Design a protein around this ligand. Sequence first.
Ligand SMILES: [Mg+2]
Ligand SMILES: [Mg+2]
Ligand SMILES: [Mg+2]
Ligand SMILES: [Mg+2]
Ligand SMILES: [Mg+2]
Ligand SMILES: [Mg+2]
Ligand SMILES: [Mg+2]
Ligand SMILES: [Mg+2]
Ligand SMILES: [Mg+2]
Ligand SMILES: [Mg+2]
Ligand SMILES: [Mg+2]
Ligand SMILES: [Mg+2]
Ligand SMILES: [Mg+2]
Ligand SMILES: [Mg+2]
Ligand SMILES: [Mg+2]
Ligand SMILES: [Mg+2]
Ligand SMILES: [Mg+2]
Ligand SMILES: [Mg+2]
Ligand SMILES: [Mg+2]
Ligand SMILES: [Mg+2]
Ligand SMILES: [Mg+2]
Ligand SMILES: [Mg+2]
Ligand SMILES: [Mg+2]
Ligand SMILES: [Mg+2]
Ligand SMILES: [Mg+2]
Ligand SMILES: [Mg+2]
Ligand SMILES: [Mg+2]
Ligand SMILES: [Mg+2]
Ligand SMILES: [Mg+2]
Ligand SMILES: [Mg+2]
Ligand SMILES: [Mg+2]
Ligand SMILES: [Mg+2]
Ligand SMILES: [Mg+2]
Ligand SMILES: [Mg+2]
Ligand SMILES: [Mg+2]
Ligand SMILES: [Mg+2]
Ligand SMILES: [Mg+2]
Ligand SMILES: [Mg+2]
Ligand SMILES: [Mg+2]
Ligand SMILES: [Mg+2]
Ligand SMILES: [Mg+2]
Ligand SMILES: [Mg+2]
Ligand SMILES: [Zn+2]
Lengths: 118, 102, 77, 156
Amino acid sequence: HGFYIPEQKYLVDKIGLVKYMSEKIGLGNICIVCNYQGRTLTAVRQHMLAKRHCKIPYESEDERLEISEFYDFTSNDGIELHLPTGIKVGHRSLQRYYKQDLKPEVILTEGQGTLVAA
Amino acid sequence: IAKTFTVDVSSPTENGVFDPASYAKYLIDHIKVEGAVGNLGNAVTVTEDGTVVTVVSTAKFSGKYLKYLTKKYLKKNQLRDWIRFVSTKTNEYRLAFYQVTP
Amino acid sequence: AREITDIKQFLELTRRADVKTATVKINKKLNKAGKPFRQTKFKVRGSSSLYTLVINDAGKAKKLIQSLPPTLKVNRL
Amino acid sequence: ANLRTQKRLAASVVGVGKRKVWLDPNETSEIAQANSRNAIRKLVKNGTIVKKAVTVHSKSRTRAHAQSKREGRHSGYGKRKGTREARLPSQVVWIRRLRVLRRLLAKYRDAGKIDKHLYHVLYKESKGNAFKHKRALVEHIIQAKADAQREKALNE
RNA sequence: UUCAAAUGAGAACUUUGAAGACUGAAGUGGGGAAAGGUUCCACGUCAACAGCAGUUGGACGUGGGUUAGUCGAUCCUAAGA
RNA sequence: AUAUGGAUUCUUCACGGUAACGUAACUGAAUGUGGAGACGUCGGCGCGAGCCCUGGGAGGAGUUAUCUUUUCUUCUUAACAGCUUAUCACCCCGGAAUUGGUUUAUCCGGAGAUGGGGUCUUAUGGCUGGAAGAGGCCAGCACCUUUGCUGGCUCCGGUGCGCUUGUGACGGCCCGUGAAAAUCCACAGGAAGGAAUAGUUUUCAUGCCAGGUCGUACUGAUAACCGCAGCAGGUCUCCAAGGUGAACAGCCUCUAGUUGAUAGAAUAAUGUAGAUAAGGGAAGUCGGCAAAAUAGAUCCGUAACUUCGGGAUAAGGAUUGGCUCUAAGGGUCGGAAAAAAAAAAACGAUCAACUU
Ligand SMILES: [Mg+2]
Ligand SMILES: [Mg+2]
Ligand SMILES: [Mg+2]
Ligand SMILES: [Mg+2]
Ligand SMILES: [Mg+2]
Ligand SMILES: [Mg+2]
Ligand SMILES: [Mg+2]
Ligand SMILES: [Mg+2]
Ligand SMILES: [Mg+2]
Ligand SMILES: [Mg+2]
Ligand SMILES: [Mg+2]
Ligand SMILES: [Mg+2]
Ligand SMILES: [Mg+2]
Ligand SMILES: [Mg+2]
Ligand SMILES: [Mg+2]
Ligand SMILES: [Mg+2]
Ligand SMILES: [Mg+2]
Ligand SMILES: [Mg+2]
Ligand SMILES: [Mg+2]
Ligand SMILES: [Mg+2]
Ligand SMILES: [Mg+2]
Ligand SMILES: [Mg+2]
Ligand SMILES: [Mg+2]
Ligand SMILES: [Mg+2]
Ligand SMILES: [Mg+2]
Ligand SMILES: [Mg+2]
Ligand SMILES: [Mg+2]
Ligand SMILES: [Mg+2]
Ligand SMILES: [Mg+2]
Ligand SMILES: [Mg+2]
Ligand SMILES: [Mg+2]
Ligand SMILES: [Mg+2]
Ligand SMILES: [Mg+2]
Ligand SMILES: [Mg+2]
Ligand SMILES: [Mg+2]
Ligand SMILES: [Mg+2]
Ligand SMILES: [Mg+2]
Ligand SMILES: [Mg+2]
Ligand SMILES: [Mg+2]
Ligand SMILES: [Mg+2]
Ligand SMILES: [Mg+2]
Ligand SMILES: [Mg+2]
Ligand SMILES: [Zn+2]
């Protein structure tokens, strides 16, 4: 089916992350993703196999707040962005301004400079 | 028969903006095997040590596919335009920044 | 223009007294078995035409490089 | 400055249309100094000049309307314009039908299914539009061998 | 058709970027014959010419440019001379 | 020009193959015969090229609130040479009514079919060389009148009433039978020429030198030609992308190319070009002049008259979207000293089309 338990590293209650998921398809009979309500265990079951949702989304930031207990978590300017290491990273709109190399600073000799000041 | 693809998430990860956990959480769910998602038949392997991500599959799959699901996960988390997917050598790919300044 | 097969007769050509130059070219290819190997081509310029022998065997090849006249000018690769 | 020439050479060196040539507006003093191909060469690789991306003509829409076409999507009388003939000429469906049978009967002749006598009728008979399609043929054949065993088993 | 910048004594019209459009492969595309004869290209330049303009030009001034044993002429004969 | 090799000869100008013919060669004057050069047109089929469409994979960009194994793009191979490959024909075996073979197209066979086994034209393709060292695409480095250098990857296939074209074998037509020469080669002929201690030869391999004279830019047209001009006219041809659709029509887009035809401000009458109108429907006018209506397709129906071919799309009726289905329609394969600076150590499978 494709059922995957996010951060297998961090789980306390993982035997109870099984009980909260079987309460979605167990009683109220709900899909883990859709909100689709089957009438029977068959319904929610037949469907999970249908549009193919076996995955409990970790990407939704309200979904990390819902399933939070059964995990144990242990201890844009438009131009450049500011990283924690000191980095200034560029943007994909300027990609051809980056790639373009330009003229070096034009630097006079003590011979050429001297003659130009005089 | 097995083909194995390798991506290096080191550059963006170490600098604070990236999580190979979620990246390897995404790939697993969004690969399409002879059909819809979640169908990896022990025909597709996504595992990672945190500085790299491994991809190994007997099922239909490609270099371009890995690039497509890569770019799509970034725009979702808006790391697009701050990160670009390049090929270091054939079938081993690296994630990088455009401009790097101190 | 032409390719040579027989090596014994290839060697005669390597003198011929009018053949001034030649070259040794290496090609990474992969066989019917899909495995990388080194086939090498021996190209000897004659007056009006250019002969090239194909040795898909690196050994009998690399010793033939030890089979060449001291007179010849060889452009390596 | 007058940059016409620099744009011309750009199309020629890059080997692409003047449409697709980019000249950096901020580089307008430097590009001015180009004046020769090999100079433009340097500028091209440098990145002051760039060959712009091809504008897109997408086939996805057709491939959709193309995919649906093979599901028997719009065959409708109102979706037709030309005569039935001009669309798929009669003669053509024929030369399909004929070569299907002649190749069919041939195969049987050789594999022992039918001798050259049953072959010679059917050939002469098919060519007279006595057969609708390939199944209609095999039917007439099996009825031809069945009765021949109806004329064989009463002679025993 | 429109916006900015560049150049400029000066910009509706030149150069570049941007956006909008047209020819839409029987083309406003790429090559030739006949005819043109330097109109090609570049540096200078704006009195006169381009029925508005002009910093641009098929204009003006100074120069550079056309490399064949195999492409043509050449040879052959056609109606004819 | 010629020299070396190869071949040929005491059976002088070679041998093999039943034959069609084969080969690295294998004397041939006068003169004679013969071939190429050398030719309409249309039809439909057969094949090849490029194009188009298209799956997998290796790159690179685009879009991503939601969606889409996505959208676009690079993935290329010349003249020449070697091996090999064909429809037509032709050769040997065979001797056929139970008439067989067979083209889309009905032609052929005791003047020797089917069938069996072979020969050939090399148009065309396939491999190899030419040739990856080229080009093409991605990632890097340095360098600014140095100029380049380094890495990677260039892959493997599919489909067809498609398009453009080349070509093949045929067919229809003619009181129409659809150029000539230069040139080149073949054959007949047997002049003449020559071997045994030596000779013949350049239609075989290789090697050596030479290739004159003139044309060679650009335009080929809404600005380079002719129209007294930078004129809405005229002027010979090749290549030809996707979609709609019968379609080289119209309508939109890609590769390339323009954005150039004096501008601003208003929005009266008259206008030119373009549209629409209640009830009426030619009452207008010399005259239905102009406009209007009808139009594609599939089905049904189709008169007098006729030189029996037509007339005829006669007239005249019905249907046409979108969506989900149903059935029918195929192919392949298997049964001197001190300090400092600087330098150096009948099935079954599979494959793919659309068309009704
Ligand atoms: Mg048609
Ligand atoms: Mg159609
Ligand atoms: Mg018919
Ligand atoms: Mg203007
Ligand atoms: Mg248009
Ligand atoms: Mg138009
Ligand atoms: Mg033009
Ligand atoms: Mg030209
Ligand atoms: Mg000019
Ligand atoms: Mg000038
Ligand atoms: Mg004027
Ligand atoms: Mg003036
Ligand atoms: Mg002049
Ligand atoms: Mg020469
Ligand atoms: Mg010639
Ligand atoms: Mg003749
Ligand atoms: Mg290729
Ligand atoms: Mg080749
Ligand atoms: Mg050839
Ligand atoms: Mg090769
Ligand atoms: Mg290369
Ligand atoms: Mg075809
Ligand atoms: Mg034509
Ligand atoms: Mg020219
Ligand atoms: Mg033209
Ligand atoms: Mg005109
Ligand atoms: Mg005059
Ligand atoms: Mg055409
Ligand atoms: Mg089309
Ligand atoms: Mg079209
Ligand atoms: Mg302009
Ligand atoms: Mg005017
Ligand atoms: Mg009215
Ligand atoms: Mg009314
Ligand atoms: Mg009325
Ligand atoms: Mg009246
Ligand atoms: Mg009146
Ligand atoms: Mg009248
Ligand atoms: Mg009228
Ligand atoms: Mg009538
Ligand atoms: Mg009618
Ligand atoms: Mg309907
Ligand atoms: Zn669901």
